[PDB]
Structures are given as C-alpha cells and as structure tokens.
Symmetry: C3
Subunit: 285 residues, 3 copies
Amino acid sequence: ESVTANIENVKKVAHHIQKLTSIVPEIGIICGSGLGKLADGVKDKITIPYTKIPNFPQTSVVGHSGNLIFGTLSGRKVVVMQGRFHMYEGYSNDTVALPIRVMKLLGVKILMVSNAAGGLNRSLKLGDFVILKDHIYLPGLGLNNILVGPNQEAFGTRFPALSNAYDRDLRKLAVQVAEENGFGNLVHQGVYVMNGGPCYETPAECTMLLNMGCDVVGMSTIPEVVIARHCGIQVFAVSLVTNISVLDVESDLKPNHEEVLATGAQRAELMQSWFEKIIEKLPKD
Amino acid sequence: ESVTANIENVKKVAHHIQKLTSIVPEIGIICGSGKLADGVKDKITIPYTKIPNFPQTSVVGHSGNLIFGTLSGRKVVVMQGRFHMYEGYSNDTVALPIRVMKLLGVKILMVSNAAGGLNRSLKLGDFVILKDHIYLPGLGLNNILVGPNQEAFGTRFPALSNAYDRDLRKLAVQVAEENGFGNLVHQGVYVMNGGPCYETPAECTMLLNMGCDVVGMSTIPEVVIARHCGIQVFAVSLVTNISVLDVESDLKPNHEEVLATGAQRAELMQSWFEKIIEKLPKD
Amino acid sequence: ESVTANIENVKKVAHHIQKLTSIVPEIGIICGSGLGKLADGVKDKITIPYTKIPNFPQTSHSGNLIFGTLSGRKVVVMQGRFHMYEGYSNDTVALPIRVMKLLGVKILMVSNAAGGLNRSLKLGDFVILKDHIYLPGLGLNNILVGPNQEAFGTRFPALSNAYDRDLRKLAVQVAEENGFGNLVHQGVYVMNGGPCYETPAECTMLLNMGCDVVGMSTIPEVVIARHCGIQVFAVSLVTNISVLDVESDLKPNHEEVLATGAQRAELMQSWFEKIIEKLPKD
Ligand SMILES: O=c1[nH]cnc2c1ncn2[C@@H]1O[C@H](CO)[C@@H](O)[C@H]1O
Ligand SMILES: O=c1[nH]cnc2c1ncn2[C@@H]1O[C@H](CO)[C@@H](O)[C@H]1O
Ligand SMILES: O=c1[nH]cnc2c1ncn2[C@@H]1O[C@H](CO)[C@@H](O)[C@H]1O
C-alpha cells in the first residue's frame, strides 16, 4: 500500500517536486501506448526520476526508473508521467493514487492518458484510436476499486460520481483536432473495460465483454481516471487498438505484447502529434 | 480483521452484550436508508465503543450503536452504523456483527439500503424488495466468506436458495399494500458494486442487462453471512436515484439525493418495517 | 506463511521431490470431481504427502503428490487442491503447478465439479472446458497479479487455445469410441470465487454471459499452467444443475455434489486413463 495517498504524504511529494522544477503543470500526461515519443518531445524539459522523489511510488522499466517530465508542450506547462503503476504488477491503490493526487496539488487541471487496448468492437481496426467516453471498471465493481478504504476527503468525496468522467468537451476537441488534421477516420469513441490482468482476455471473456457493451479492453488506466475524477481533474483518455480481441476459441491468432508494442511504436508519431495538437487547442493560457 | 469472526470471538462478543442487556432479539435490523432506530420501545442503546472486539465504526461524531428493544411488540436489535466493504473493512469485521446477532437469538434480519435504480420502470423513492442478488465482488473472489469456513456458523458452500425469504417478501408486499403504498413496492435483483464510485453509465447499462434491478455497495455481504448462519433475510433498497444509462446526460448520482430521497421516505420505510415486524410469525 | 512461486522456491521444491522419486512426470493430473480412484490406477506409484515436501502448500488427511505410471505414461497426480475460497494465496496455488512444470509435466489434466448453467446439460455430464471466464481475474484477482516470474512465463500470457484443442478432440474421440460420447460436452467454465453457490440471478447472468458451467476453481491453475507452457485439458463434472429460478425449491448441495462426483469417478478415471493411453508418445 506504499505510502498512504493522503494529503500529508501527497503534499510532501508535491513540495519535493516543486523544489526541483519551477514548472507548475496545467496538464498531466500519463504516457501509455504510443506516447513514448511525446515524453521525449517536451520542451525545456526537466526530468525527475521516481527514485529522486521521496515517498513517490517506485516502478522501473527493466531496472530503469520511471520519470516525471516537466516542461511545456504546445506552449502549455505539463508534467509527463513516464512509468505507470499497473495493478497487475501488484501495486497498491495508494501507489497508483498518489502520483495523480500529487499532480492535483502540483496544479494539474487536465490529465491526458493513452493506453493500448484490444478491440472488442468489431468495427475497430488495428491502429485505431478509441477515445474513452466511458468505462466499465470490473475490478471496481468487484471490490478492487482503487478508492476502497478510508476516503481521503482532502482530495474528493466518499462516493464520487463518474459522470462525464471522460470530459465530453475534451473528447469533442480531440475528435475535432483529429478531423482537422486528416486522421478523423482513425478516431472512434468507446467504452473501455478494465481486465485486471495480466492475462489477455480469453475468447469467451472477450465475447462477454463485447456483449456487455465494451468497445476496447485493457488492464490499466481506469484506476488513474478514478483518482483523477475523484480529485476533480478532467480526463482525456485514448486507447490505441493494439490488437483485435479474439472472440473465437478456434482462432489461432493470439494477443501478444510484442505486437502491442509494435502497434504503439507505429502509431506513436501520430498519437504524439495528435496529443500535441489537442494540447495546443486546450481552452486557456 | 481485528478479530476472526469465529465461534469463540463471536460468542465472547455476544456474551458481553448479554451482560449489557436482557433483551433477546428475535429480529435484527440494519437501517441503511430510520428513524426506526429512534422509535424502538424500552430501548437499550449500546455503543459499539462499549463492546470489545466488536467492529468500531469511523467517527464523525457518530459512533455506531446496537439498539435493543421492542418494535411492534417484538424484541429487536437495531444496528446503527454499518461496515461497508468500500471503507476497507474486512470480511471478519462485516461478518461478526451478523454472527453476533445469530448468537443473541436473531432469527430474522431486516435490512434497508439505498440503491441506484437500474430497472427503467423504477422511480425515485421506490422500494425494491430484494428477491435476489448479484454479488459481483463475491463472484470475483471477494466473497465475505472467502477463507476458512467457520463451521460453528454454517456450511462451507452455502446455497443462496430463497436467500431473500419469499415468505417475508410476501408479507412485506401484503403489508405495503394494506397500508396504501403497495404501488411504491417492487421486487428485484440487487447487484453489489464494491464501490465507492457510483456506477458509470456503461456499468449501469451492463448491470441492467445482467438482469439487475438496483445497484448498491452494501448489504450482500451481510446477507451472505446471515444466510450462512441461517438467519432469514428481508432486504429492501430505497431507490434514492435513477442510474444514468448513457454518458450524454448531465445526470450524476450523488450521495446528497441519496440522503434526500432517504429522508423523504424514511418515515414510510420505518412504518413499513414496524408493520412488517408486527405481522411476523412468532414462536 | 506463503512462499513466492518464483523460480528459486519452485526449484527447491521440485529438487526435493526429485530426491523422493525418479518418476519424471510428463502428465500432471489434478484430482477434482470424478477423480480419486485415479490414484489406484497409478502403477509403480509413490505417494508423497505434502507434509513431506518443504515449502509445498499444505492442505487437509494431508494432500499428496502421487507419482507413477498411468496408461503407459509417467504422471504426477495432485491429490488435495488449494481453492481460493479457502483463503489460499496465489503463490500457494501457483507453486504446485510450477513445480509440475519443473518436474517435466507437459500436459495438465484437471477435473472439477461444476454447476450446469447450460440448459442442455444433465447431471453427471462431462463438460470439457474449451474456454473460461475468469471473473476473479477480470476483477484484479488474477492469480498472476504481481511481478511476472520470467523464468516461467511472459508478463501478458495469451489464453488462446488455453484448453488445448487437440487434447479436447482426443478426449471427445475417446469418449465417443468408448460408449459415453453422449455424456460429453464442451463448454465455457466461469469461475465464481465462492464459496457461496451462485444465486439464481447470478446463474442467470452467467448463463447469459455465455457460460456453460460454473465452479470455484481450476482457472487459476489453468492460468499458471498456460503461463509456463503446460498444455491443459480440463473437464467439469456437472455435479448439479444450476438453479436459475429464484422461485425454485431445488438448490445446490455439496453433499450431492460429492455424491455425483463419486458416482462418475470411475468413468471419469477410465476416460482420463484412455485419453492418456492415446496421447502422442515421443
Ligand atoms: O487485447 C488486450 N487485452 C488487454 N489489455 C491489452 C490488450 N492489448 C493491449 N492491452 C494493454 O497493453 C498491455 C498488454 O499488452 C497492458 O498494459 C494492457 O493494458
Ligand atoms: O446509484 C447507486 N449506486 C451505488 N450505490 C448506491 C446508489 N444509490 C444509492 N447507493 C448507496 O448509497 C451510498 C452512497 O450514496 C452507498 O453506500 C450505496 O450503497
Ligand atoms: O453449482 C456450483 N457452483 C460453483 N461451484 C460448484 C458448483 N457445483 C460444484 N462446484 C464445485 O464443487 C465445490 C462446491 O460444491 C466447489 O469447490 C466448486 O468449485
């Protein structure tokens, strides 16, 4: 359960960070699939390894620490989160929650997140961007909701509503930007269902998920979104369709993370460009 | 998680309470959405803080109590202060008060809760008698009974057949009918969302299509513990809000309207429970 | 009280067992419903009580690893299972399967008792698992949650052909050619963490999710076996017809489940023996 994502600990992390950068983030960006280049494209960047932030949860990519990247992107002050805390890795709720709440105290108003997901919706193609317009939080329905435990009233209410969790205006903007930049055809909106993971969904599971009205399935993101919505950060989330979910037990096609990475790699340039352009048009200063 | 809800710990809590009161409750009541609590005759109000190894509620200036007394001539114990799983309470913490009730002599547990109305035919303030449930956390390996079975209390694999005693439901309906508010009463399937987030429109749509009538974040664990130890159950959801099914609507479930609709129906709900208890069969 | 199912701990346990037996099993069998007499059929057999295997999970009459030969093949039979509804950890469930891997197991055959959701199912039917819905898994209680043990498998295992189709085809042919093809179905097994039987509403929902049988086990081991590359054959004995009607008097009862399983145990044993008999030998 790392350090409790309470106001005390979150403030402490926040203040440590504020020592290290003069950048007050307006936008938090959770680097998921296809956003690896975005991270690297931050201007006047300050890079703060998780290992350099006391009480910040620790995650590593093959022994390399995740980083907090501060700077501007499309003229906007941002904090890019490079290194996420997936529940399938065993991370506790407080661990996932803390970075988001730190973002809150840091000044973040809008969280943008990407992920890789399997396309349940049969109209989806590989490489499609599915803007999350809603989610089904299977772990949350089953008592693994990231918010289970004492509510941190400092951050939000005991029973947050998740109405407009995926800010409809941000979604309208994102679609708009895709349309204007000639890749609206790649952009869909859909329901993202979280499979706790880390197993890919079996065909029966995919078939069930599809029947439940899920468009894409992934193993991430929702808990972050919940914490974000809980503390009043607006959320924009896109799933990169990194594979078409197999609904048929007899198919020899099988999901594999290498192809997920491949699709993320191939769509990273467009996704970055898209996020940069969305950000450029975020209504403010 | 402070104490395993086994026969020894439970017996100890029961025996302690029995020093504190001579009332042997036949009916255990858990009020989620009165007021009833208030109107129990000759009440002995025992704070949880007074009961060692009994779960203790979070504060807020309102510690929970076991209220013992008579309602409609019947001996009852009212549980004021519930332990909801979304709070991070453990299985043992939720189980124990119910098993305590068993030892104290509770034969019937009556529970109210607030729920989102999934069923489109429902309106705010409606009462949905639970006739069945979908225990999503239970299915997903968070069943309150997960762990060593406490044989003192019940079987390893409890059937949840007639879990919402059909006779109690029939009586409850009859009573609501006889008292001019039968039109408010429905029966349906309660699905537990572990919570504490309200359900997204997509979740509600999924829940509705799973055959769920109302959704809430409580009750089932208690019901499971009760049925496991053979307490009959009557449970009703007050539809404190209509679940929003599509993401377009401004919508928004809110604990405020929960308390509101709650209050609006609190005296009816309490009246109903009293009148039901009035007509329960008596040994 | 739970040792990580990592390569170190699993090797220690495997190596220990290897100093109690020289049977290198190629087939692991996990005794569920209808299995139990299976051990009797095992020849040149050594019983190894779990109590005798350091760091091996311990279970109620302590469970046993039974090594030996069945239908001309080296098998290890796991007698005594670790069910998540008992409170056992993922590591407890995972370790024996991973031990089997190290011991040389190529094929895991498993039976369980299940409620028959599919309305065409009869009591005592065999439903070969051809797929599953791991409700605990979707809900963040997947046995693999935690650091991926790379010695065993990949971070994100696919569950494609989890229920090896060739094993399933063989199983069916054996049933068909031995006069009980009519007892044999294939279906989707959904795991209810349990230990409560499914309410009528739940069964109804599960049926509508596309589930044929419901039980409280098996999937975790299947997931661990698929993760480390063990092929899986799994059969649910329909030990009761799930009740979908909340107005029904019929109810699941474990005594009956045990009774129905015990009744089919002989046929289930014969089936497994005959399947093994026909397994490709290299
Ligand atoms: O089809 C899929 N099912 C579930 N999660 C997926 C799928 N495709 C991509 N992801 C996501 O990408 C990584 C695993 O490859 C995970 O982090 C998961 O969230
Ligand atoms: O629409 C709903 N979804 C889930 N729980 C609800 C809903 N309406 C009422 N409750 C109940 O109200 C409390 C929070 O207000 C929760 O404890 C829940 O059980
Ligand atoms: O109808 C059922 N639902 C769930 N599990 C079942 C059912 N029938 C048999 N089992 C299995 O047998 C034991 C309980 O009797 C459990 O271990 C469960 O996995």
